[PDB]
Nucleic acid binder design. Structure first.
Lengths: 82, 81, 272
RNA sequence: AGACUCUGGCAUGCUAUUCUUAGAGGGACAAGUGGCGUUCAG
């Protein structure tokens, strides 16, 4: 099976471990981006808000002479913020 | 939408073994799809039901002689077992 | 107080009152604008189609209120131009609306103005949201298709520079639209120009695209349930002896050659 | 000019449940209509 000398080493080691075992025992004793996911009331609120915003910007005097220039400047400011 | 291979070959074999128990409308095709085949995928089951509805609205406009001999063959196979 | 499915018929009803609307009705139209845009990005595809058709017919309705068609369409555009300013979803909505409008009234906007919009779309190419950049790519594709190559040429560099510094993940996701845009630019211009002004990695895609441009140059049951010199061959059949003079002999002369799952314990088939 | 995989909208249904939940079960598959179509693929 296995050599005798290895068995003798194992028996000596287990007996030694029992010796310190007895010694230690003795020592112890001491708003998403996708709309399809989003709800209808928020779509209605967004519709009303964008209606008001469109009306206000259409009523602005700056957005009557140079519309595309104003849109480009607004986008440039908005994404230089980004 | 384009068509695949597996749905339609499964539909062909399921007709070739159980043409008697099919119907004409989509709901009966669905019902026989659950009660005959396990078909774990719901997408595949829906596509199978659609194509078998197409098959039932197609082949019922054909000659009745082939349908009659196919029913005789299916009844003979069922009676043999 | 309109529900989400009810948008689909209502737009058509609005459509049904556009094509005979009189000139003294601009306030109603400019109040309807945001609803039409939000329905161009509605959930239902039918509502989206109705809103697109409403936009086309509504731009047609401004082709009747004034003598100058180009100025009227400029007014129609500046009624929808603020949509590129507010919330992210409605900005994507308005980019989609401008993308649909660019394909219909192609020259009538005036190309330089379109170029300005293209420049704005280039700013919109730098957005974080994927829907806005997707709509910007769609507008860029429509502009490349529509407005002239002579006016494209002064704006190739800016649009493809906005393309180039997009992202890693954003480039990786929409590789289809980028591939199609590069294919269109290579078809419409020199391949060496696009190679010169793009960054390094895109060049790989370019050579593949270039190689692509190299490569481009009856009712019976059994028949339906099927797994899907020569014509002068005849078969006789031999019964009584064959009478060639019999009127019904052609029935005995043929023209063609005569002649996977596991079952469970219950008996139901197994499909996978 | 993705025929690859997964998947949403609506549940007054089951589960500790019509308003918030999270497991399951449904629901849509081009299914139906009219045209164009080699009368079949689309």
């Amino acid at each position: 099976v296995l050599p005798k000398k290895e068995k003798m080493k194992l028996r000596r080691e287990q007996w030694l471990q029992k010796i310190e075992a007895i010694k230690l025992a003795e020592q112890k004793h001491r708003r998403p981006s996708e709309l399809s996911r989003m709800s209808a009331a928020q779509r209605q609120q967004l519709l009303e808000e964008e209606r008001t915003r469109f009306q206000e910007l259409l009523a602005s005097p700056a957005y009557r002479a140079s519309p595309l220039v104003a849109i480009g400047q607004t986008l440039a400011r908005q994404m230089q913020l980004e | 939408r384009v068509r695949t291979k597996t749905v339609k070959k499964a539909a062909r074999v399921i007709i070739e073994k159980y043409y008697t128990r099919l119907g004409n409308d989509f709901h009966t095709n669905k019902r026989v799809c659950e009660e005959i085949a396990i078909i774990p995928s719901k997408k595949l089951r829906n596509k199978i039901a659609g194509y078998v509805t197409h098959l039932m609205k197609r082949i019922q406009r054909g000659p009745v002689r082939g349908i009659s001999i196919k029913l005789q063959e299916e009844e003979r196979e069922r009676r043999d077992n | 107080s309109t529900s989400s499915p009810a948008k689909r018929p209502r737009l058509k009803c609005l459509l049904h009152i556009v094509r005979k609307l009189s000139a003294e009705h601009k306030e109603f139209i400019t109040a309807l604008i945001p609803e039409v845009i939000l329905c161009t990005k509605e959930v239902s595809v039918g509502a989206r189609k109705n809103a697109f058709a409403l936009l086309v017919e509504m731009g047609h309705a401004f082709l009747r209120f004034g003598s100058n068609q180009e100025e009227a369409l400029q007014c129609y555009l500046v009624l929808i131009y603020p949509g590129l300013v507010g919330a992210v979803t409605m900005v994507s909505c308005s980019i989609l609306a401008l993308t649909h409008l660019l394909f219909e009234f192609k020259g009538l906007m005036g190309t330089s103005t379109v170029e300005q919009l293209l420049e704005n779309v280039c700013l919109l190419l730098a957005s974080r949201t994927r829907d806005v950049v997707k709509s910007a790519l769609g507008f860029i594709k429509v502009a490349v298709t529509v407005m002239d190559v002579a006016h494209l040429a002064k704006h190739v560099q800016l649009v493809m520079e906005a393309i180039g510094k997009l992202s890693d993940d954003m480039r990786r996701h929409f590789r289809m639209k980028l591939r199609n845009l590069f294919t269109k630019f290579i078809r419409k211009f020199g391949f060496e120009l696009v190679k010169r002004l793009l960054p390094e990695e895109y060049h790989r895609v370019l050579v593949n695209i270039r190689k692509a441009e190299a490569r481009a140059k009856g009712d019976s049951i059994e028949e339906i349930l099927a797994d899907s010199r020569q014509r002068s061959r005849a078969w006789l059949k031999e019964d009584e002896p064959l009478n060639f003079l019999d009127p019904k002999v052609a029935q005995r002369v043929l023209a063609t050659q005569p002649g996977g799952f596991k079952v469970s314990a219950d008996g139901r088939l197994i499909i996978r």
